[PDB]
């Protein structure tokens, strides 16, 4: 019976074997007041106290978010679903620990992904029960708010500022501070991580002021804040504020009073009109995420990372080899994940109306240009598998390679990686490859359970995936010292060296999508 | 009659003459509870309190240790063993300080080495008079527990958590930064040396988080914590523990019985069975050393090092020319200190299987190809000195000047020295050359006494090697300044600059058994 | 009516017309208890404190010393003699501070030379009244102890430890850091300077360490410690207090006793027979000067020096084109201030035999070869100019340029000067040339008084030095920037440039005496 001390009581874990070990897992502490009632909307709250052993031995409530029903009965979309109970009562978190206890333990903090709109951390994949066991690291997770309820912004305005959700992650970072030394952690060594949505939240986490102290270095999966869909502009916000509120019938005059009718609705008004709040969204909307509120964001943050107004710090930036496919089967006409998908130019021209509708007749043309000189065979997948890179190399690939150059160049080390594995279960079809969320795994070591029928090279991947991200955490550097691996370079501006991560070998390569990535970051920010 | 007061209580001294000046010696103060009992494989506890003058005027007890039997009457081996009486109650110190006392001393800190099964303080060769009255040094050893009862591990677990004596080495070093000053010491001016396991034990400390701010500077002579006896695996303690309990009866199914049942033996029972609890040791066994535990060492060391994870300071590193060839006569066939052990290639063939136990018939084979292409003429004596530099070059000259290459890496100076004077006074045979533990003597300054028979070359010789060894503790720097010595290079990746020590011209040379080292560091460990 | 608040009491200082403004003055301010009794060779004790006015309106008694008697009613040697009583109690210093009273000065503290036998602050050349007129700085000058009284030695016995006089100079700049705010000075901007015994003086509190924080910077005029006649060796100190036990019949067994003895001694008998606790002394000798107490001084300073453990801080160092003339008339056969003093090869050749009495007939040979290889016409000054360039650059000129290439070897900026210019009013005779001393006179800025009659191009060098001194001890840069001056260079290893200073133009130079200095250096010190 493994009971820990923390500064607001008592809380009771649960032993877990695995691998023949023992790893500690205390689900579900809460780490603010629940915001309902007068409290939803408004930065969390500090926990009260109490006094009693909390039992933290299940998975607390998820977030309110809306749910993927694209696919039902569909492993490849339900897996990113939620798996516990929907309610604003959901300001909680994880904590693994190795058992025994560690002394000075390394903490690596989870921040998951889901577009701001939806995510939970108790998901499968997210489970850090297997870095405990296998780098005796500790690992915790936090639920954040999303949607609406985490970010709705009239700038400003104490009763929605906005930014709530990434307030929430703080607020959890703090706990860590407070906290962690009990369980056995080193608050002084603390790395975030973070997929997507979680990755870009990790990026705006080194840009604020409160956040520099709550951590010591970050990674960021297929994410960053300078990504197109990463933040609100302070016009596109209060528009989708009160296009909320005229959707519920809010409509106020005085403002404040529009956020106390909003604290009267059901939260499942609020989730239906979501979608509603802009005039025509993309599969990659979000319409409620970051905004520059002048307190977690102090200015554009653009600005902040141009001008070196950042944590200085080392980091660990990546993407997958096909990040954009999953986006392709939510919309884009003549895809399927049951077909191969081999589309017509006329379709494809449709799909980048689907992709930029705000965009006009010649921005649109510009992308057809870029991505269609081939290269040249015909080829019937041609126009297929340029749909899935433009996707992926505005959205997720140039947007992380121009992060990583720009904070590199004040001075510290940033290690960069391509992940080109597709794994041996994924239930998405081939032409989708190396999809966006599946390195995911690899990194929480789930082919390390010989049980769940990943193939052996893929063990193996995971194992050095792991190594490598736990030597990061611990000492800033993502190498596998013992197995005469590839040593991981520092991506430096002029040479831009990265790893690839894939089952066979390991290389350094150089200026990953030089020549697509000139297009988006450079022209088409004018169009 | 010298009396200081120290925060555990008074401590009575006794008066030497040296070289016609005195020095102040406390012999046998106690810094840690005896771990007795109930105490017996746990850290060592901090010391009560007392009220009365203890006596600290000769040598205390020796830890309870194996002695080396192979050679009795003879001086060559019997001055290796303990001069003291052995006892579970030996966690003791000795301090030497100038006379008058000093105004705020240099300290050094001897540990000496033992393979971790053997040793003590008390040795002759280790009496810190002679650094104390020419240096005006302070000179500090203490006795640490070996074998078994230093190093049982059951990792995790606070009954035998590993590494006792290291912890016990820990605690000396926390006893002179607290009491130090009281005999004129600075606390801010420590550097620790030891030899063998004892300069393992010194590069332990580099790594390991508590010691960093117990101590300023190292020396190691003949060992580095990679050298491939020095730390024991997680798997191997974990199997030479059980082992240790089938062989007492203390086999049980609750690991804290099997330790509850380890602290009812006899001390001479436990003694008696450590050699068995391998399948087959080697003249270079080391049973029960150092291990992760997780608290004195938080990761494989390998990873540290190659890392960057260790104190940032100085280091004076260095090996004797001959290391192996005192291995050669306990046991490798055709050798023997009473001849001149011309042996066979049969022979030598034999020796590396009885060096190389668990290693494949190929690995065997690719050291003797290695070691065997002569240079040329038929030279009886090719195997026998062979035999000797894979002995040497494998267990201490390859791993030291690697350790010493990767710590030079990550920015501070490292001084590397190549010991080749063959004491005029060595007991073992010419054919034995230069070997391992017998620069000691002269580190301590033996040869200063002109009573004792050294040649005045070895005067001189010890006079300059006390000078630098003084000079680097003080001041980071080995250089003899006063006589147009050759000034001493820092040994820097790339270059490796090493200074040669010897009666006749000191050199400085370059890349010290480059080939050999190629062969040991890059290919061997696949093997 | 000007009164000061010190930490031990009032203190009344005069008013004092300079140059139609005002300059207070603060003459005599105790800084120690008088050292007398029971206190005589031991250590300044700390004061007392006082309830009343201390007066500080007139000089204090100069230390007890042996007065220069050679050239009585001459000016050129009576300049240099006491002009306040001689007494024991003499720990007493000057204070001028500009009026009004500064906010936060710059603080210059004088120590004056005189070989550690002779000296006393109240010296007019000293007079620091015009330098805080001028620059507005404020000027202290301490009187410390000397001869026996100030550095007799029995090392290690606190009766008398040594080193003396230069703790009284220490407490002295304890003083300065308790008081000097109450005055209007900056604490934290304190540059010491000194000439001859005070530079060598100067450049021990760079290398001791409960000096490291008295003080910001230093100047050296004409003196260092690696002099060859600044620092005692412990054999020769403990020679020459048991010769002068012997002399004085306070031979005894006990050495406390010794020392009981010499307290009982009147001052006239301790100063009588300094001169004969050697067995030849020459006109430079130094009998009782500072020696390695352990304690002040922590071991040689050579080795100090050499292996950069010092302040780390700018210097300003120089010396004078004719150091060695002045000691030639005291002593060397066919010298004389009152001819022209040419002489012959064998004079030259007894004159070596005067000033170098311990050295081997090579030795001396060795410096006759180096110094008249001439160069060529001949010249009957030959050997005349020789023998003062031998003793000039033996005891002055090349250890100050060493002591500058080791000390600017450590990363610190150095400038150094060489001083060419005659005094129109030296009493001495031409052919002694620019003498050692003769700086001084500019640097406290005597050529200011148009009242005087030096010439109008001493009044504008010595302005000049006045202002590089004052910018060197405010910002670390001797510069004179306002009025085209040359720029002061850097003196680094390798190009080593210094800076001339004369009445006529100011030149940048390289390598001082090269040839001569490689000789004193390198080769000399072998002999
Ligand atoms: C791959 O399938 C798409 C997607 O839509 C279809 O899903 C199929 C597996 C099948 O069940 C089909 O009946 C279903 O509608 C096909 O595109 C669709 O085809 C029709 C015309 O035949 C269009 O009018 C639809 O609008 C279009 N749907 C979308 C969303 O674009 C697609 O042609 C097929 N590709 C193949 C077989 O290569
Ligand atoms: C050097 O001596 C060895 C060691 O063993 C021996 O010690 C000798 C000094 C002598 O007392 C001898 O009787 C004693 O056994 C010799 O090797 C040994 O020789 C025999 C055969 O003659 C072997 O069967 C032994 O096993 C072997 N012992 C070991 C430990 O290997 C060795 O030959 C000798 N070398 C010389 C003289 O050059
Ligand atoms: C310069 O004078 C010296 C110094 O000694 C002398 O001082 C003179 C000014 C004069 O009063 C003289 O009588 C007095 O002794 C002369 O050297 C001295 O000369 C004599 C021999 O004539 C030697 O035997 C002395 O020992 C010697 N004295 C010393 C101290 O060396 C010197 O010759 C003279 N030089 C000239 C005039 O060029
Ligand atoms: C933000 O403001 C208006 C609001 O229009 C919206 O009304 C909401 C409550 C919601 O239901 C939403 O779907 C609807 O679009 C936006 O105006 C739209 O723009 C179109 C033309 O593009 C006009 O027809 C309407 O005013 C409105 N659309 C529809 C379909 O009725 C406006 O575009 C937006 N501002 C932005 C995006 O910057
Ligand atoms: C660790 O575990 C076993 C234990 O075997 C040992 O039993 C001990 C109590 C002790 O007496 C020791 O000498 C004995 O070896 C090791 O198994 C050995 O391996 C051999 C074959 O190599 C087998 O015959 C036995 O199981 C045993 N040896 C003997 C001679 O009986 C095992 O090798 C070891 N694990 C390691 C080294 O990783
Ligand atoms: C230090 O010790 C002796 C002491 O000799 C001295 O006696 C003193 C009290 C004093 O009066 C002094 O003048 C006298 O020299 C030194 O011994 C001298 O050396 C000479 C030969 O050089 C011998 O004749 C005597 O022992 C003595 N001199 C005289 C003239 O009587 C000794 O040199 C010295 N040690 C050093 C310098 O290292
Ligand atoms: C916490 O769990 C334990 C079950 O072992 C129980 O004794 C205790 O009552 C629980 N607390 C609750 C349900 O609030
Ligand atoms: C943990 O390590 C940090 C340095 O990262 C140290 O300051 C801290 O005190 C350690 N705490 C322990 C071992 O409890
Ligand atoms: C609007 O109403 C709120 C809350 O009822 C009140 O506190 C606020 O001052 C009002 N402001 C304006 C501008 O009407
Ligand atoms: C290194 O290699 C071993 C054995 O060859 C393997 O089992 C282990 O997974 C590897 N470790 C890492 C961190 O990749
Ligand atoms: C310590 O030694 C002295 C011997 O000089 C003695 O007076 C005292 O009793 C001793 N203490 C012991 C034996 O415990
Ligand atoms: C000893 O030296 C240190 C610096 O190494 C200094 O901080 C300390 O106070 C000194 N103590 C003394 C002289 O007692
Ligand atoms: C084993 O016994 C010990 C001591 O008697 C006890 O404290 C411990 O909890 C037990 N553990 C197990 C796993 O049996
Ligand atoms: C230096 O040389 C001297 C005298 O030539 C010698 O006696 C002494 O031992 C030497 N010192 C060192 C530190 O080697
Ligand atoms: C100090 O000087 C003044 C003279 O103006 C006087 O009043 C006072 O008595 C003096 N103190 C002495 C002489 O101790
Ligand atoms: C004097 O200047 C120093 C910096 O050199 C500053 O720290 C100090 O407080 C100042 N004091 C004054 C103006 O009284
Ligand atoms: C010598 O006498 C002194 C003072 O009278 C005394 O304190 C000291 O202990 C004695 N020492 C020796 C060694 O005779
Ligand atoms: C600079 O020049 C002026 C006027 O030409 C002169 O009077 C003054 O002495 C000079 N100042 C210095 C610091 O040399
Ligand atoms: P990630 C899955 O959180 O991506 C955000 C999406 C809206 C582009
Ligand atoms: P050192 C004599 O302590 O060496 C250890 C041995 C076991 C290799
Ligand atoms: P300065 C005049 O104090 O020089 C010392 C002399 C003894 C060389
Ligand atoms: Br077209
Ligand atoms: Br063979
Ligand atoms: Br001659
Ligand atoms: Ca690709
Ligand atoms: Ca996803
Ligand atoms: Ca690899
Ligand atoms: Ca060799
Ligand atoms: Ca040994
Ligand atoms: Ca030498
Ligand atoms: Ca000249
Ligand atoms: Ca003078
Ligand atoms: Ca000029
Ligand atoms: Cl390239
Ligand atoms: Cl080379
Ligand atoms: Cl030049
Ligand atoms: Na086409
Ligand atoms: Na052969
Ligand atoms: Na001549
Ligand atoms: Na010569």
């Known amino acids: 019976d493994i009971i820990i001390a923390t500064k607001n009581g008592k809380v009771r874990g649960m032993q877990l074997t695995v691998f023949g070990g023992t790893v500690t897992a205390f689900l579900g502490i809460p780490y603010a007041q629940p915001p309902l009632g007068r409290l939803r909307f408004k930065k ?27 696919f039902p009965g569909f492993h490849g979309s339900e897996m990113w679903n ?36 939806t995510g939970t951390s108790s998901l499968h994949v997210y489970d850090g029960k297997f870095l405990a066991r296998v780098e005796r690291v500790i690992v915790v997770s936090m639920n954040y708010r999303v949607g609406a309820l985490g970010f709705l912004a009239l700038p400003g305005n104490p009763e929605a500022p906005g930014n709530m959700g990434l ?36 990026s705006l986490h080194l840009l604020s002021p409160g956040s520099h102290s709550l951590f010591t270095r970050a990674i960021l999966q297929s994410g960053s804040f300078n990504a197109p869909w990463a933040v609100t502009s302070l016009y596109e916000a209060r528009n989708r504020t009160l296009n909320l ?38 599969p990659l909307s979000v319409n409620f995420g970051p905004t520059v509120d002048g307190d977690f964001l102090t200015d554009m943050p653009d600005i902040l990372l141009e001008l070196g107004q950042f944590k200085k710090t080392q980091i660990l930036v990546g993407v997958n080899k096909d990040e954009g496919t999953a986006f392709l089967v939510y919309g884009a006409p003549g895809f399927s994940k049951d077909n191969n998908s081999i589309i017509t130019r006329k379709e494809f021209q449709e799909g980048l109306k689907i992709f930029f509708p705000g965009v006009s ?35 997720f690939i140039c947007p992380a390679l121009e992060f990583t150059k720009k904070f590199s160049e004040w001075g510290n080390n940033a290690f960069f990686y391509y992940f080109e594995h597709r794994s041996s279960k994924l239930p998405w079809p081939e032409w989708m490859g190396v999809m966006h969320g599946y390195e995911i795994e690899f990194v929480f070591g789930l082919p390390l359970e010989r049980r769940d029928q990943y193939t052996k090279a893929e063990e193996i991947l995971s194992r050095s995936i792991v190594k490598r991200w736990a030597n990061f955490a611990k000492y800033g550097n993502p190498q596998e010292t013992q197995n005469q691996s590839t040593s991981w370079p520092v991506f430096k501006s002029t040479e831009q060296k990265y790893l690839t991560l894939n089952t066979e070998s390991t290389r350094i390569m150089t200026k ?10 450079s022209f088409f920010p004018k169009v």
Chains 1, 2, 3 share one sequence.
């Open 44 to 70: 969390p709250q500090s926990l009260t106290k109490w006094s009693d052993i909390w039992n933290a031995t299940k998975y607390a409530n998820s977030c309110c978010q809306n749910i993927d029903q694209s």
């Open 82 to 117: 939620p798996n516990t109970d929907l309610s604003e009562d959901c300001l909680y978190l994880n904590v693994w620990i190795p058992a025994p206890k560690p002394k000075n333990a390394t903490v690596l903090i989870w921040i998951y992904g889901g577009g701001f709109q």
């Open 167 to 202: 307030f929430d992650q703080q607020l959890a970072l703090q706990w860590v501070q407070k906290n962690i030394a009990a369980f056995g952690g080193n608050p002084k060594s603390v790395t975030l991580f973070g997929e997507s949505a979680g990755a870009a939240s990790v």
């Open 245 to 282: 509120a005229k959707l519920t019938g809010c409509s106020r005059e005085n403002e404040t009073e529009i956020i106390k009718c909003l604290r009267n609705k059901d939260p499942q008004e609020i989730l239906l009109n979501e979608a509603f709040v802009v005039p025509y969204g993309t």
């Open 361 to 395: 007749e010649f921005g649109k043309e510009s992308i057809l240009f870029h991505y269609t000189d081939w290269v040249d065979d015909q080829r019937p997948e041609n126009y297929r598998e340029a749909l899935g890179d433009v996707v992926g190399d505005y959205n």
């Open 512 to 521: 990953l999508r030089a020549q697509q990535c000139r297009f988006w970051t």
